[PDB]
Design an enzyme around this catalytic site. Sequence first.
Site, PDB file in Angstrom:
ATOM      1  N   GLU A 104       0.807  -1.211   0.000  1.00 12.04           N
ATOM      2  CA  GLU A 104       0.000   0.000   0.000  1.00 12.04           C
ATOM      3  C   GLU A 104       0.843   1.266   0.000  1.00 12.04           C
ATOM      4  O   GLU A 104       0.877   2.045   0.960  1.00 12.04           O
ATOM      5  CB  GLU A 104      -1.030  -0.036   1.153  1.00 12.04           C
TER       6      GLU A 104
ATOM      7  N   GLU B 213      -3.731 -10.355   1.997  1.00 15.32           N
ATOM      8  CA  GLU B 213      -4.116 -10.311   3.408  1.00 15.32           C
ATOM      9  C   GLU B 213      -5.606 -10.602   3.481  1.00 15.32           C
ATOM     10  O   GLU B 213      -6.375 -10.102   2.655  1.00 15.32           O
ATOM     11  CB  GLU B 213      -3.850  -8.916   4.002  1.00 15.32           C
TER      12      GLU B 213
HETATM   13 MG   LIG Z   1      -0.521   0.259   5.840  1.00 17.34          MG
END
Ligand SMILES: [Mg+2]
Lengths: 1003, 1000
Positions: free
Chosen positions: A458, A522
């Site tokens: 990210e 995830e």
């Molecule tokens: Mg993060």
Amino acid sequence: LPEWQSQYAVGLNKLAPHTYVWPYADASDIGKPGGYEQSPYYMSLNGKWKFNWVKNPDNRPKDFYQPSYYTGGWADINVPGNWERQGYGTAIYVNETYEFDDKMFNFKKNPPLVPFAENEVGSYRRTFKVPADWKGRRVVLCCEGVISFYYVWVNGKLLGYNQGSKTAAEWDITDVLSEGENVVALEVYRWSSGAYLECQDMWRLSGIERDVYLYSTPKQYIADYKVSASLDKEKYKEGIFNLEVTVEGPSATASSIAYTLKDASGKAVLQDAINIKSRGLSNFIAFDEKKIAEVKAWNAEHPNLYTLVLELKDAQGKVTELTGCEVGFRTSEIKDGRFCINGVPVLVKGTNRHEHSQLGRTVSKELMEQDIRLMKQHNINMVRNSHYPTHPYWYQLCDRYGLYMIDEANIESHGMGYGPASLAKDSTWLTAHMDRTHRMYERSKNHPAIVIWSQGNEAGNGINFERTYDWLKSVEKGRPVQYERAELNYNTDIYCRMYRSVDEIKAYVGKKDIYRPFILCEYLHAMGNSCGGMKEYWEVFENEPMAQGGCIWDWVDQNFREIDKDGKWYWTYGGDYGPEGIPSFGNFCGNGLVNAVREPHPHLLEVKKIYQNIKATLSDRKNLKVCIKNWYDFSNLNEYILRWNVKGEDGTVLAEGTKEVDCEPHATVDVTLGAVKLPNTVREAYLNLSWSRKEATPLVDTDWEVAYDQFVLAGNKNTTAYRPQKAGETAFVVDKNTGALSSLTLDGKELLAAPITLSLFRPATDNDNRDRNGARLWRKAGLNNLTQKVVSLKEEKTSATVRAEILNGKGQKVGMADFVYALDKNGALKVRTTFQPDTAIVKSMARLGLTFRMADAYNQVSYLGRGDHETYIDRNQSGRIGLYDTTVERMFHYYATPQSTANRTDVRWAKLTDQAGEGVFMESNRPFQFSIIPFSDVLLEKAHHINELERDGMITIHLDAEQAGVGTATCGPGVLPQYLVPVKKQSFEFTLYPVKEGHHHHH
Amino acid sequence: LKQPLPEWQSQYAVGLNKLAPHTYVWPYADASDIGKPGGYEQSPYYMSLNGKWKFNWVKNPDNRPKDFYQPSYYTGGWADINVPGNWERQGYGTAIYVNETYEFDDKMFNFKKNPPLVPFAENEVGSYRRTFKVPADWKGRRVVLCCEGVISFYYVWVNGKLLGYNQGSKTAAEWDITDVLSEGENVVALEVYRWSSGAYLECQDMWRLSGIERDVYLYSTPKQYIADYKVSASLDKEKYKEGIFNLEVTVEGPSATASSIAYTLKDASGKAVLQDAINIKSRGLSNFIAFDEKKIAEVKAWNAEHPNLYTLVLELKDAQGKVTELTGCEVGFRTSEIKDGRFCINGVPVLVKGTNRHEHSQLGRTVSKELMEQDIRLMKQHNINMVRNSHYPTHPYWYQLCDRYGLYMIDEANIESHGMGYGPASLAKDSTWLTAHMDRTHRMYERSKNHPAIVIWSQGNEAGNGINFERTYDWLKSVEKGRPVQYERAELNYNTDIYCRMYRSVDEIKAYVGKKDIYRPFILCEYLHAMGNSCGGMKEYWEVFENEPMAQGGCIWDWVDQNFREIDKDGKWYWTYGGDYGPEGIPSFGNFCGNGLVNAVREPHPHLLEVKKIYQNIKATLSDRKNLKVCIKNWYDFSNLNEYILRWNVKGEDGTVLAEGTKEVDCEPHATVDVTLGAVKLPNTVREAYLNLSWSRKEATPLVDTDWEVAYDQFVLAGNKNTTAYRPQKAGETAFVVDKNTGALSSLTLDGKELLAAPITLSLFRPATDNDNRDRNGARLWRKAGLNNLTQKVVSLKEEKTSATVRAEILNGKGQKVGMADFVYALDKNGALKVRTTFQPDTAIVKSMARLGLTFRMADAYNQVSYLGRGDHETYIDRNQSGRIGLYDTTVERMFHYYATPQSTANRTDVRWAKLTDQAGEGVFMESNRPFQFSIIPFSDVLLEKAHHINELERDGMITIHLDAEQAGVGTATCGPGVLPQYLVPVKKQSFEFTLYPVK
Ligand SMILES: [Mg+2]
Ligand SMILES: [Cl-]
Ligand SMILES: [Cl-]
Ligand SMILES: [Mg+2]
Ligand code: NA
Ligand code: NA
Ligand code: NA
Ligand code: NA
């Protein structure tokens, strides 16, 4: 401006990234994880170092690097280990933000700048002596990891600096070394430009995190080498070995580089050598490709490793340097849209893992070994290096014990966002992105355990990740390259979109022209009492060829253990260190399957069950014919042993046996066990199946249960041979004002410490606090501040009927309830309840049942129902129905944030007694749930830290006819519809039987 | 009381079901490990239980988890603690430091001392428990649980079965657990109490802590085992050459068949020198075997200088002659006795150059092998030959080290009841405490009776005198025929073979030795208190020890500071002491816990270097300064000087070596030998030269290599008194300004650049050392006279172009008159500024002065310090025998020593000149008309004085300079003699001068 204020100053004078080339004296240690540390050409610099800490660079001891400078007045610091865990500065835990982007530091985020006056400086320095045997040799200084930025000097001479805290920085210090006492100094800065790319959701710490050492090689040495050990793409049986070596350093005479590939036995299988001569300072050597027919393949189930021994020799053929690594023959690829290992599509049963221990980011060999041991024992086959490369020892362990790996570049700029300001779109940051990517790659390219390269986390998407992706594809032709923020753009070989729901997974695999498998980077956020809904995820993974699983978010909680003034310990999280106002994101740093000291949480056991590789279903109930599915990828079922039995509700073995089933990977097979005679004394029996391995591994012995299953067989629904006998005279009193059962006696002795009341709330789990249908709605309805007000009470000789209003602390009418307390001839008390909620106020409930309290002396617990551990309706595939004995203290799990715990599902009956054998038998008219804890719901809900928990002398009982599942709302989907408590008129009953079993003395 | 108080409230409940005190009999598999310190831990018959244990702490026993010892009890919710290690150093309770009192005897705990009772509700309970498995090869063997040391009291259980309990925290408590062990998982538990009746005998001046302090382990032997054995390795009393060997062994346990006990004494090479075997077979579960006395001609003797050790190998054998058990120990042949009123080792009268030593580390009482090795190494390097185990037996490893590296030891019983006093209430007089005293004495003796390094048994410390100590003395006498027994509180009564009265002054020593009918030597149990900047007057002590046959030295008080290192909010570290932990009002005796020769992490204090010089065993005197003939005395007791090398040289004041050489000399112990080094011409360019002597041994030791200086001396040689070759050259135009009000030198410039950060004033005070704070002639008088708050006021001023004459009054903060000062500032032709000063004190107000000199400050940029004077370490007039005069270069920061309590430091004696400059080489050169003293520190005098903890020290950008014509010594007033008369600053009229030469 100084170098640590530039996104460009990633380093100076360091060695170019390369694979580890530790010189060995004994080729036998090459196969030993960490064996290189025992080489006479290796010298650790770990241990005590003089240390000084200061807030603001202008106040630092600027000349401490000069050998003459006096540090005798300084304290000592342990190296490695973050300084915040050694009494300096302040440990800070924040998530999607930069800790320095806060008013406490009078600074606002503005890449590439970081606070000046507020920045911290840790000056390290120690003396050392070079071994006499290193006389004339080349010596290299290796710092495996120092966080954020640092300048380094040896004997007063500046070697350079570094940015990038998760991969090693090295410097040739040969020409700077002196005879006798030498000096090495590091000036470490807490923040630097590089910090904008290290915004991982984790503790933000400082200092030397990993080993610091010296290693010696001759002037001409082995600087790097690339291994390629695959299989033929037709039948995946023939090994294809390719090798390239880079020799560096001056050499006026001739020399050569030879290699020998040995099997575990020690026998050479491949050998070759090339002569070299050059006035240049580097030689690139490409060996002829070799083949191995019927090669011993490497995979998670069978981690067969060959040993590569490289030797650099004189013109006389004398070995001047020896080094090498382990080699595993296997292929990793995306074939026809599916991720395949050795041409076999595999289900990814993994977990993310951060490096964490009480010392900080520093992790010991013992903890690394325990992590992998627990992983293998719990049927995990893949690990994702949670947002940065790990200590080299970790890769070595995975190669040796068989664990696939998704290695990842230390790149996360979460704080800058994914919009136009994302550092992924800022070209001035390409140097930093590429540097971290090159270092990740070169240092671990030869590890067979690594099957997937991940570009980072990210950090946004754009030109920088397009370029680092292109580079990776240019050097790597044997491993897929993925990146979650690239979502479906070209720059990712696997679609790994995190935390998507089951429906979203289905939507993807059902899309036209997709060419990449869906493997969640995830999923299943394991924060607190969590991991509900796992079953739904895997029914899809096991049914969809292009939905191959994923990695559970976080292996181990990032908590530190502290002791308060009363000697009570507790786990710490965001905001627990420093003054008020310190940047913080609370308890969100603890999301593991196990706690910080590697003690498994109950949900890990659910993971073991769902991840098991031997799954059965009952095909024919009368003759006990089961259909076994082998989920192993490279192992036949005959490598395991089936140990079955059938037991009555009373716990007696009605039948048993042992089988060896033959079954190809991914194939199913039927095994008839045979009908079993069930007595009329049991209402049901259970067919139990347990598997273990014939051959032990160094991490899992032959006693470990690798997989198991249970099937419920119907018996005599009318028998009551289980019920206990009448203990004496039972009496009960009903509160005239609340209508609750205020008293229950046995021959006069009171059994209640608190009255029996209607319970609809549960001390919020972390997920409940974020679930759209969780605690927010329960607390809004005031379900945690309930009161009962009678409007009708009809008493009798042995029974009583009552209608009462259920009110919250606001006075509002939460609902209306009817209780019917009747006393049976056997002395048993039946309690029927009928609740009608006011849907205009009650939008959700946590449970539907009864609650009361008893003295804490009643600590003996026994029950017939699901397993030895905590389960919930959306997390109870694990465990087994059977008779269990334990205590109240034993059932309480200490989640970092005190919350609901100790639940048991599929319960037929529960019983609680004191040392004297007195207590109560509790059952319903259908399977129910129950929980007994040593605290009050009030205190449990209120507490945010373990140490706030305090006993008051009573235990709390909950008998649930309904109780919600736990979901994973802290990050990802909340409890699924079918596991939410119904908000409508419901009726339910529970019967209490007083009991007197006596005091049994025994060892 | 309907029910009796628990065991921990009774002075009688010292132990239950424990093994009788015995010498360690660890079973070995490899005899080769016997001669190795800690070797027994590598035996397959040894299994440590140290490590992580489940732990629970509570204040108030009623609140403890009672059933925790039962295996079924759940501890999964408990934290872990490291074993061994006091719990206060692991985040539990409160570490407390008090001296002569009981910490529980305080209003904070609602209790008043009242033997044998200790507080109940305020007592702490540490519940320890861990799981363990028994080695498969131990099936059928006897297994023993050994707890080397746990403090105050504890109950112990294995698999839920109460083994017993114990009092006495400094000796091992053992239990035979063979019968309670079970296959599979075993559970061992300890319920430890911070306080118990036993604490009344554990009132040592040290940190009062709790928990398991030493190793916990298991060991297994066969059913019939070697329980204990007594060794006697002596020498004939006429020649002390022939070794006499005696050995008794006790074998316990049953045996149906015949068996035998054998022994083999081997030399260092492994060769057997003695051997014998006796047959045994009895229906009795106890057999005593006493071997025939054997003799060894010219046996290799053991002593501190040459610790020759033999190895005793004991073997228990079956009827078939098959070894069932192997064990043994190191043997050192030597005698220890009081002969003709003198302490003698192997017939030789020896000087005791010792130190007292407490077991201390950052973990508390627990000491690692690494630290013990460091302690012994540093001791040997600094010429210490004796160690007194400061009021309790130490960890077994310490004795093994001393046996191997050669260090005499005074072992001491864990007995000190200082808090009850020495009056009628003294526990030494309360007969009901006999069992307590005797139990601790038995344990001290049995466990170490065979160590050759132990030459003296001490019965305890500051525990009064009476029936109990007379009894234990008599007991030790009945069992020990080869070691003197001493007790300081017995003073001169019969129950003590050595007079060891602590902290006596030099006169008191002389008074004793000169007394009629004395028959015991005077060897100080404790002396030269090394707290803070201390150890002054050591020379006077040793002038007496070296010339008085029956005054043979002693042990300095404290080897190592009992401080802990902590870090404050700003990252600044500091040493802690009494009162630094816990709530306001906690019992405390402040900084008196730090009295060592080295700090807590074993870094030497400046005074240890003086100790090294005075304790050295090679001392010379310059007999003929023309031909440089020196007289050398060999103070070693068993070594000829030919085992050493003498490196000598003559160096001028300019540092140039004028002559040099190396010589080997023959000289028996206690004898002297003259050595001629030859005349050496001195250039007329030097005012003096120095004859340097330095010694090192020819052969290394594992602890001392051949480069280590074992002894040294220096002699000043007269040169051309009139030369000024050493002086710096004129660097520019010098100028000065005299303050019109103070008459102080407020400005000194070089080519217009200001050099001073503070004016130059008269200084008579010094930030008090711990000793100054208690010295009869110390800082109490200095502060009472306000010498630390001085102001000068001109009463007369007359100025010429290049000079200025002033007379000023010196007033304290109360306007009083400290005295009268006269200054004369005059500039040379070469730009030097001569400062003449005359001070007349008003003896009505000034009863004492710390010093007499000038003081001023400069920017901290001036950090380069150079000087010609007694160098390379801090010294004072009554502590400057160490070091030598020469040219030295250093920095201000490098000169500041960090005493636990910030105090005066960085002083240099016998200084000819001192120079201070910045990196660019600019600064000032300073000298007087005779040798002086000076100090330069990075802090102000005000802050240094005010600061009580190191982290309070803060730099203000200026360094502080002190030029002293006079400065008092430091003495040892914290406990014992204050500064001697000849070292006090004279409180009289005095003149002195200092000349400042600006340099560039
Ligand atoms: Mg993060
Ligand atoms: Cl990195
Ligand atoms: Cl003791
Ligand atoms: Mg005392
Ligand atoms: Na998190
Ligand atoms: Na809570
Ligand atoms: Na003391
Ligand atoms: Na002070």
